[PDB]
Ligand binder design. Structure first.
Ligand SMILES: C=C1C[C@]23C[C@H]1CC[C@H]2[C@@]12CC[C@H](O)[C@@](C)(C(=O)O1)[C@H]2[C@@H]3C(=O)O
Ligand SMILES: C=C1C[C@]23C[C@H]1CC[C@H]2[C@@]12CC[C@H](O)[C@@](C)(C(=O)O1)[C@H]2[C@@H]3C(=O)O
Ligand SMILES: C=C1C[C@]23C[C@H]1CC[C@H]2[C@@]12CC[C@H](O)[C@@](C)(C(=O)O1)[C@H]2[C@@H]3C(=O)O
Ligand SMILES: C=C1C[C@]23C[C@H]1CC[C@H]2[C@@]12CC[C@H](O)[C@@](C)(C(=O)O1)[C@H]2[C@@H]3C(=O)O
Ligand SMILES: C=C1C[C@]23C[C@H]1CC[C@H]2[C@@]12CC[C@H](O)[C@@](C)(C(=O)O1)[C@H]2[C@@H]3C(=O)O
Ligand SMILES: C=C1C[C@]23C[C@H]1CC[C@H]2[C@@]12CC[C@H](O)[C@@](C)(C(=O)O1)[C@H]2[C@@H]3C(=O)O
Ligand SMILES: O=C(O)CCC(=O)C(=O)O
Ligand SMILES: O=C(O)CCC(=O)C(=O)O
Ligand SMILES: O=C(O)CCC(=O)C(=O)O
Ligand SMILES: O=C(O)CCC(=O)C(=O)O
Lengths: 318, 317, 310, 317
């Protein structure tokens, strides 16, 4: 369904030093979160308390899995409802220079229904990491509701701690494209998009590749940092804040010399959840910018769409 | 990769013992229980769905499938809903078919299921759907009656509950001109049992449907565009601790005429625990099955190949 | 895709292929009768030793036994070499793999570097020498049977220097998908051969079929000890339509492996091709180079002889 | 291979400014030709006596043919032994971003057996151009011999004017690649190779694309010049000069914005011709670097190879 798109190779003039940095354990974190979410939809989290040991072991097990042979990996595929995938992203023809694991959580662990990966050592290293990253996600969302003045402390966080939360966990591997070294153009690792749910929390190895789109349309590279997290505002959080936090549009450009390995936690609510601006955030007679929908509805619409589509616009008011 | 071939079926394979259930008769409950215990399959006559409703749904489907392939492909692919061609599920199964896979709310097309977009086709489907869903409820009440369950809705409540996972599928098996008169036929839909509770099929007059009898022989079901054919699915085999056996069935494409099929699949809500109804568990009787939710069964189903024995991994030692 | 075919039913085995005993009087009359009535005949008592056929076969069996990666090194098949499934240039396909090889006189051309194995090349070359002698004797028998005093009137076209002779080794492996289904896969789709004659030998496996004049398709029983000879289009023209070229095809055997050797006797490229003077034209003037290049612009099943008819 | 390789988009620093230029109507031509053939294997030819008019009409008629629809073009397909081709180059998987005509020549014009193209106007325009460029090839080969100090003035030119010489004529079309505008990388129009014959003579429209490898391996861009010819030493001329003239390795980098149309005459000898150093160029005792072979052998070994292969190596001692 067409090939992987090419992109102009990123400059070093494209690097972005202004990514906001949030010390979760700290005073003024709640305000730094709000500010970053308002102007970028994206920020780095440090001193998050997830051990570098568990991050390193999750990565090592992932690298081991992806180093298997293509037929051995294909036994865990395809990626839907869960499992291993190669190049194809979603259902509608998108492709990237990547391979990945798309996995399902129950609360703070892999779901037992999600039988990939089968190797107990990989599964156990993933589960320790997932526990850690899920607590960071909850803390980020409490810092959100706090910096937004929400008395209810779990106003956001409770949507992913609820029973039957739709929480997704994805391991991406962008191998090197050696065919393109020095040629001025680079292959898309993961085409541009916004994430559909509340928040995503990413951790990578040290290889570059992640880019975000600024408000003025410009694409900038985010320097990688294997010991910190990067947090995305997703479309659903754009709606719960009535447009105050805009979803960050982001993509991955594959490196032509080093493998890039990423772990991403996606916080989504239960399927039945009605997604609308939090009553607490609407002023007197303020109108929602959005039609009413449920998460199940948004998610299904999402899977009928292309990666780069503006999925929110179909649910915006006219 | 490629669509399997099969021995063309000849009149020697026709099966005359398909149980008949007269849905308006008070003997339906006993016929249904008997058929579910012997074949997992039965025809349903005198069902109250008008032939004009069936005709107009079929006519609108045929028109959709007559569209060019680029035009159909715009309603594709088939997941989470929509149009599909040849590929069945996610794991390489293929058949000489195209189809629509549609989602329901209660007894109509779900608003979120945007396919088909054409309001005439949608209206005809919604009329047919309303009728067949009523047939399925009646069938399931007859089953519970014939099983001796006090609660009349012991089964039917599972597809009428809020958040029911009910699927509606339109299958088109077109002619295969190339195989005309060659002694072999292309697979229309590979062999499988259905995962949920009950399936209710109606087709146009074309042959193709086959079922496997308990001894494994494949026999052809005579088509009847005016009746329904009901399948026991894996989840109902579990609710009856093995009493009702899921029917294995397939479609062999006809090399001469289109076969157009409508199928309603009755599933429960995703969170339903699937286990032997406690009413059907004698004294000390042990369930043959591990406990599981419909969500779990369905997720494991989509990880499997069409012909896999999906129940096997949920059976006890 | 590879076209499927109705499986051949024993009903259509043809027992009446003419038999030409090459060491018997009246070989000449039998040869000519079969070239007129069928375009096709069996050749027995031909002098090629059983031993030289079996060694050609087993070395070819050995070659096809290699891995697909190793066989692909000798491919694809043009201007010579190994091919798989694709026949010609215009999308024809069959369930087969093969070697198409070029001959210098009665041997594999040194320029034809496939196959590389010396053992295999030896067996082929000894086989090729035998069958080419059989081809010459067969063409000499046709001139005798036509009342032509020059007994090399046909033979000379393939003994000339620069004669264009091709040799192919076909392998039709089993098709397990189809066993006992009543439909068989095409091993090699219907065609007439463009040259003067072709001389075929196979192992015992069924699969060769010819079209009778009608033309119903009938199965020819295999016979590993004998050759089967086709009239090709060029020989139809050299006889102004008296021998019509046989239309033939191969239907792969779903259980069995069929291995074939075919020599194709063509003239030199410069050869002007017309009814032999001794036998007098329905055909336009053309050279073998012309017919060959036009043949390669066509599909297997095309009537290549029409665009050269009046 | 199945992908068309990409290459760095050529910058202005890659522009070769010193392509050798040969005034064909000049007495110094012969010295300039030998120097260029030894040092670059490539030179430009000006003041060549082919009318701008002749070139324009062949070009417009080729543009007309290529603007035909794909189904209509494909009926002159495929390209072997003669005809139309798209993307695929030769037999062994090479691909470029182009379509083309591969045509056979007889004497000074299109061979009648090469039925493509059908349109007598195209054919007529092509034959006028072909007559012009073949005479340029003959004059070039005459200047080569004069400059080697060979007495017999047709010692090279006679191999292509001879009866049954294997001359080939190719019309290449490199359409734009809009998908890559501004991305810094370009798509391969025609992969690197040397030509197997004696000489090749090329003329294009004004769109860039042609690049050659210098002796030190650097790839440089050749400025396009729609009114001049560019001449390549081929592998066979390397053998007839005993290694003195080295065949130029070259390629085309498709322009992403504009269409590039090319004609190329390939001067080869008759198939039976023994290819070896010209007697005159071996001083007593001097050893030929090459096994003995015939054009037919070299040409067939060439078609068994891949485009970038060093075809000359297997025929070295
Ligand atoms: C075409 C796609 C691919 C989607 C769904 C749809 C649009 C949005 C994409 C993502 C983007 C974010 C998450 O990785 C994901 C798992 C998610 O939730 O949305 C993606 C999902 C997928 O890759 O399968
Ligand atoms: C068992 C399931 C669950 C499916 C459908 C079927 C197989 C594929 C699954 C997904 C996976 C991707 C999307 O979330 C989804 C909405 C989709 O489109 O496909 C899923 C859908 C569901 O969870 O309801
Ligand atoms: C390989 C497949 C194809 C499945 C899923 C999985 C196993 C069972 C199949 C069916 C069988 C019955 C229904 O048609 C269906 C919609 C259903 O519910 O189960 C099918 C579903 C699909 O086509 O998407
Ligand atoms: C479509 C094809 C395939 C041709 C060329 C063209 C038409 C005639 C075919 C044969 C038919 C007979 C010989 O096998 C053959 C080697 C031959 O000489 O002619 C074939 C050749 C080829 O396979 O390369
Ligand atoms: C080096 C050669 C020799 C070719 C062209 C090119 C590659 C393919 C060869 C053939 C092979 C098949 C036909 O005989 C032919 C006439 C044809 O069409 O292709 C051949 C042609 C030739 O011998 O003149
Ligand atoms: C891979 C290829 C493509 C070849 C044959 C083989 C090796 C050399 C190539 C050229 C290169 C020069 C001419 O364009 C050509 C027509 C020629 O004479 O040789 C090419 C030929 C072809 O395209 O058919
Ligand atoms: O893998 C990465 O580094 C980011 C990819 C991404 O944004 C996603 O998978 O939604
Ligand atoms: O389409 C038909 O006729 C029956 C196919 C079937 O049984 C199914 O899709 O589950
Ligand atoms: O004997 C065989 O199987 C091949 C006969 C044939 O049809 C051919 O390839 O020309
Ligand atoms: O087509 C061009 O412009 C040059 C390509 C070339 O040299 C060739 O096709 O051999």
């Amino acid at each position: 369904v067409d090939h992987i798109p090419l992109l102009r190779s990123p400059d070093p003039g494209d690097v972005f030093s202004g990514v906001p940095v949030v010390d979760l354990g700290s005073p003024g974190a709640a305000r730094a979160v709000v500010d970053a979410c308002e102007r970028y939809g994206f920020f780095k989290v440090v001193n998050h308390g997830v051990a570098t040991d568990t991050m390193d072991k999750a990565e090592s097990e992932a690298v081991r899995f992806f180093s298997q042979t293509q037929p051995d990996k294909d036994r865990s595929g395809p990626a839907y409802p869960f499992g291993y995938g190669s190049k194809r992203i979603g259902f509608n023809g998108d492709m990237g220079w990547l391979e990945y694991l798309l996995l399902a959580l129950d609360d703070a662990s892999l779901a037992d229904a999600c039988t990939v990966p089968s190797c107990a050592v990989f599964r156990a290293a993933l589960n320790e990491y997932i526990s850690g990253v899920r607590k960071v996600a909850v803390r980020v969302m409490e810092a959100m509701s706090e910096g937004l003045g929400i008395a209810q402390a779990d106003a956001l966080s409770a949507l992913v701690t609820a029973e039957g939360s739709d929480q997704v966990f994805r391991v991406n591997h962008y191998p090197p494209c050696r065919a393109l070294q020095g040629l001025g153009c680079s292959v898309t690792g993961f085409g541009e998009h916004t994430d559909p749910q509340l928040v995503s929390v990413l951790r990578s190895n040290g290889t570059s590749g992640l880019q975000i789109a600024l408000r003025d349309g410009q694409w900038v590279s985010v320097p990688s940092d294997r010991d910190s997290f990067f947090v995305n505002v997703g479309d659903s959080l754009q709606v719960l804040t009535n447009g105050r936090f805009k979803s960050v549009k982001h993509r991955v450009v594959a490196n032509s010399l080093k493998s890039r390995v990423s772990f991403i936690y996606f916080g989504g609510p239960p399927l039945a959840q009605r997604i609308a601006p939090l009553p607490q955030l609407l002023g007197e007679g303020e109108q929602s910018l959005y039609k009413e929908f449920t998460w199940d509805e948004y998610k299904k619409a999402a899977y009928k769409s292309r990666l780069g589509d503006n999925r929110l616009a179909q649910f915006e008011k006219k």
